[PDB]
Design a protein around this ligand. Structure first.
Ligand code: PLP
Ligand code: PLP
Lengths: 380, 380
C-alpha cells in the first residue's frame, strides 16, 4: 500500500486516493450508529466452528432474501468466515467436494489482486475472461459472453456481485440475465464474490440480484459474503460463505466438510463482528437504521463521482469523464495513464496506484476541487 | 458431541468435565477484570497483514522476556495469528515451504487432537515420540529422550511448553534441560506450542522456560503463542507466531513470507483481542492486575485438583490419585477405564471423554464432593 509514502509526504496539500476503506466527508473512519447501538454477547467462549448460529442464519437471509426456495428447503450449506477473504479461501478449498476436475477458475481480466493467490493456495489457476474495456473504461459484455461460452463445460466462474473492484464497472441486471443464461447452458459453477451488498447502491435487494438470480438456475452456487464495508466492520473480520446444493442432505455433508477445513486453519471464528451483525439484523429498529446509513454511504460515493465529473467540466476539460458516474462503488478506473498518475503524485501529491485506480472514498467536499484541477492539468 | 448430550441430559444433578475453557468456582465463564478495564481502539480499519504492530511487540516481549538477546538484535520474525491454532498452521505451512523434505513432525504420543489435522493441511505427517506413561499417568522421560535422539537429524519436534493437553503431564525444568540438549545435538527444529503461559502455574517467566531456554541454543525456534486461556479471550481469536533466525535481515525476509501465507488465508487478523492484550501489557496497572488474576485462575485449578484427591481419600478410595495433583492445568488424564467413564455418565451423569480426560475447570466447590464419591464408587 502507498499509505507510507503519502504519510511521509511533507507537502501541505496532499490527497490519498489509494485507500481501501470508506471515509466520511471529513475524511474520518466511519463507525455506523447502528453498530454503536448493537448489543454484544457477555461470554467470550469459543463460537462453534461454523460460527455463531444466529449470525449465519441472518447472513443467509440477507444474502438470498425472504422468498428464496433454496433457503426454505435447507439446501444451502453455510458458515461464518474471516471476512469475504476467508469465504473465498474456504470456498475455494471446498470446491473439490463438488466440482469435477477442479484445477482452474475464471475471473474478470481486470480483477481483485488477492483473488489469484487465494485460489492458487486452494489448488486452482485463475484465468481471465474478457470484462473491462480500457477504451471506454466500461464493460465488454460481448467479450465476456463469448469467453464464458467457449470455456470448457463445468468451469468455475468467479463474478463480482456489484461494485467491481478495482474498476467500478458493473453489468446491468439486463446484462447479468444474459451472463447467467450462458453459465446455466454451459453447466458452469458460479462463484459470487459479494463484498458490497447494500454498500454499492444503497439497495440491498438490487445489489444481491446476481446470487438471488443464479440460485434457482444452477445445481451449485457459491457466495462469499463480506460484512466489512457494509457494516464498517473491516478489521473485525466478519463474513459468511454459502454453497447451494440439491438437498438438505447434500448441504449437511458440505457443512461437515467446511468444519474439517476451518478447524485446522483457525479453529473457530471471531465473535465481535458476528455479534454486531446478528444483533442489528434481528432488531427492526437497528435494521431500519442500518438501511438509512447504507444509503448515506452509497449516496456520498455516488455524489462525489458526479461532482468530480462536473468540476472537471467546469475546469475546462474537453475529455469524456462519464465513466466516473457510470461506475459504482469506492474504486474507479479513471483511465489516467501511468505517466499521468506519476505526475499527479510528483506535481500535486495526489496518490493513486499506477493502473489509474482511484479510491473515491478519499474524495470529499474539501479536496474534490483541487483533485479535479490536477486531473485536468495532467490530461489537457 | 458430549456437550450436546450433556446439555440434553434431563438429570438435575449432572457435571460436564469435557469442556475446553476456564470456568470460575460458580461454573460460569470468566471475563478478567483487566480485560474489562482495557482500552479498545476507536478505528475499525483493517490491521496490517501481520497484525497490530504494538500487540506483536508486546507478544514478543511477553514470550521471550524483555531482555532477550534475540529480541534486542531483531532476529525474531513475528506476526499476529488466529489464536495459537493459526500460529501452528502458518508455522507449519512456512516449514513445509522452506525446509527441504519437511513432510513430518514429531509430537507426543498422547497429544492435542487438532495438531494432527493442522500439520496434515501443511503437508506434514504427525508422528509420535514416547511421552505419556499410562501406568503412572505421568511422564516417560527416558522414552522421550531416546525417541528424540533417534529421530533423523533436522527433524521438527513439537513440544507443549506447559500444561500439556490432554494429560496435564509436564516435564520439570531439570527434565527440559535434558530434552533441549538432545534437540540441540541432533540439530532438530523445535516447534513450541505455548497455549497456557502463566495460566499453567501462575508464573509467567517459569511457564515460558522452554522457549526462553531454546532460543539461545538452536538456529531456528518456532513458537505458537495463544492468548485464549491466559487472557480469557478464546472467541476473539488472538495469538502470535514467532520464529527466531540468524539475523534481523533474515527475520525481516521471513516476515515477508508470513504475509504471503496470511493474505490468501484471511487478509489480516481481527482487531479486538490484539487491542485488549496490547492495552493491558502497556499499562502498569492493568499488567499487575492481569498477573494477579492469572495466579488466581491457576490456583483455583491446582486447588480443585488437590481437593479431588483429598475427597477421594475421605470417601475411602484405596487407589493412588497423586497424578491428579502432579499434573498441571485444565486437563487431567485420570486413568479411569472406558467402562468406568461410561458408568460415570450413565449412573452419575458426569461427562468425560472415553480416554479418561477430565477438564477440571468443570470441578468446583459445589460439585467436587459429588464427583469424588462417584469416581470412588466406579473404581472401588
Ligand atoms: C472484491 C473483494 N473481494 C473480497 C474482499 C475482501 O473483503 P474482506 O475484508 O471481507 O475479507 C474485498 C475487500 O477489499 C473486495 O473488494
Ligand atoms: C495445546 C493447545 N494448542 C493450541 C490450542 C488452540 O488454541 P487457540 O484457541 O488459541 O487457537 C489449544 C487450545 O485448546 C491447546 O490446548
Amino acid at each position: 500500500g502507498l499509505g507510507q509514502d503519502f504519510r511521509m509526504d511533507p507537502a501541505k496539500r496532499k490527497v490519498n486516493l489509494s485507500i481501501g476503506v470508506y471515509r466520511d466527508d471529513a475524511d474520518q473512519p466511519f463507525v455506523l450508529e447502528c453498530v454503536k447501538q448493537a448489543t454484544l454477547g457477555t461470554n467470550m467462549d469459543y463460537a462453534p466452528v461454523t460460527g455463531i448460529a444466529s449470525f449465519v442464519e441472518e447472513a443467509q437471509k440477507l444474502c438470498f432474501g425472504p422468498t428464496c426456495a433454496a433457503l426454505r428447503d435447507g439446501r444451502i450449506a453455510s458458515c461464518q468466515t474471516l471476512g469475504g477473504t476467508g469465504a473465498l479461501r474456504i470456498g475455494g478449498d471446498l470446491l473439490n467436494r463438488f466440482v469435477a476436475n477442479c484445477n482452474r477458475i475464471y475471473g474478470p481480466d481486470v480483477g481483485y489482486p488477492n483473488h489469484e493467490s487465494i485460489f492458487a493456495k486452494a489448488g486452482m489457476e485463475l484465468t481471465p475472461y474478457s470484462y473491462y474495456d480500457p477504451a471506454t473504461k466500461g464493460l465488454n459484455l460481448a467479450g465476456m459472453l463469448e469467453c464464458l461460452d467457449k470455456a470448457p463445460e463445468g468451469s468455475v466462474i468467479l463474478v463480482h456481485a456489484c461494485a467491481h473492484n478495482p474498476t467500478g464497472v458493473d453489468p446491468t441486471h439486463d446484462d447479468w440475465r444474459q451472463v447467467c443464461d450462458v453459465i446455466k447452458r454451459r453447466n458452469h459453477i458460479p462463484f459470487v464474490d459479494m463484498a458490497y451488498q447494500g454498500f454499492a447502491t444503497g439497495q440491498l435487494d438490487y445489489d444481491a440480484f446476481v446470487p438471488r438470480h443464479l440460485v434457482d438456475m444452477v445445481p451449485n452456487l457459491i457466495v462469499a459474503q463480506s460484512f466489512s464495508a457494509n457494516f464498517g466492520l473491516y478489521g473485525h473480520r466478519c463474513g459468511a460463505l454459502h454453497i447451494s446444493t440439491a438437498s438438505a442432505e447434500e448441504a449437511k455433508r458440505l457443512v461437515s466438510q467446511l468444519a474439517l477445513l476451518i478447524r485446522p486453519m483457525y479453529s473457530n471464528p471471531p465473535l465481535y463482528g458476528a455479534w454486531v451483525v446478528s444483533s442489528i439484523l434481528k432488531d427492526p429498529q437497528l435494521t431500519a437504521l442500518w438501511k438509512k446509513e447504507l444509503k448515506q454511504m452509497s449516496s456520498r460515493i455516488a455524489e462525489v463521482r458526479k461532482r468530480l465529473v462536473s468540476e472537471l467540466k467546469a475546469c475546462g476539460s474537453v475529455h469524456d469523464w462519464s465513466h466516473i458516474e457510470r461506475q459504482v462503488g469506492m474504486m474507479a478506473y479513471t483511465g489516467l495513464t501511468r505517466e499521468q498518475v506519476e505526475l499527479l503524485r510528483s506535481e500535486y501529491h495526489i496518490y493513486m496506484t499506477l493502473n489509474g485506480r482511484a479510491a473515491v472514498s478519499g474524495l470529499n467536499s474539501t479536496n474534490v476541487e483541487y483533485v479535479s484541477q490536477a486531473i485536468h492539468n495532467v490530461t489537457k
